[PDB]
Amino acid sequence: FKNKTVLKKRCKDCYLVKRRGRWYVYCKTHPRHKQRQ
Amino acid sequence: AIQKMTRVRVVDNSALGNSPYHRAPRCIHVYKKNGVGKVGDQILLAIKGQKKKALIVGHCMPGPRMTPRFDSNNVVLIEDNGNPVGTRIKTPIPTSLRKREGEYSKVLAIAQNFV
């Protein structure tokens, strides 16, 4: 994960999910895209 | 027990050990978390204005029973890799060196006498 103030989807498979209280960008294809609010 | 600044006797065939010098060889560092070297511990020596590793093979401090106590703090010069600098050790070497953790087979092979 990379901590970002603003979450931006990078590829098509990047999806926003609110988990354990905060927003995340997960991605199956590109785990490099993993972002945490 | 050999600490920093202890003067030590190089019991070895090496030129560094057998070469005369104004300052006697003196322990500079004991490669042990407590700065106390026993038989089998490595130390760093200031010999002839040169820093050389060495191995303790005897000391005046009493150890556990059945082990020999020497009249001097005997040390053997070794290289950084571990090869003994000299090729012959004249004074007796304690046999307790064998089972201690650490490489001592080279020193035992070089040694002439055991006590």
């Binding site: - | 571990g82 090869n83 046999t95 087979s105 092979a109 002439q112």
Partner: protein, 111 residues
């Protein structure tokens, strides 16, 4: 059993460039057999030492404690200490400069 016969057989099988054996008398409180073997290079020394150690580990004597490999960091001299025999692997220059043969055959009759 893992004995000097197994040792020499394994060493000849891996083709040590030179092998010598010394029968240490019992009154000398070190061991029974003093094996000294030369090799082509540090890679060959490491390979043969590893092979003989694996054979010792796999062969027998589960009650016998495991055995170190000494001299790994240095390249020109390795050594392995077993219960009753010690092997010294080295290069020809190391062997000729340390003359372990004269030491271990002539205890106090050399220089």
């Amino acid at each position: 059993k893992f004995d000097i016969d197994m040792m020499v057989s394994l060493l000849r099988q891996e083709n040590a460039r030179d092998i010598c054996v010394i029968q240490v008398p019992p009154e000398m409180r070190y061991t029974d057999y003093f094996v000294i073997v030369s090799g082509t290079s540090t890679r060959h020394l490491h390979a043969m030492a590893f092979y003989v150690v694996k054979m010792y580990k796999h062969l027998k004597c589960k009650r016998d404690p495991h055995v170190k490999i000494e001299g790994k960091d240095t390249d020109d001299w390795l050594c392995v200490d077993f219960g009753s025999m010690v092997i010294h692997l080295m290069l020809p220059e190391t062997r000729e400069i340390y003359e372990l043969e004269k030491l271990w055959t002539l205890r106090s009759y050399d220089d």
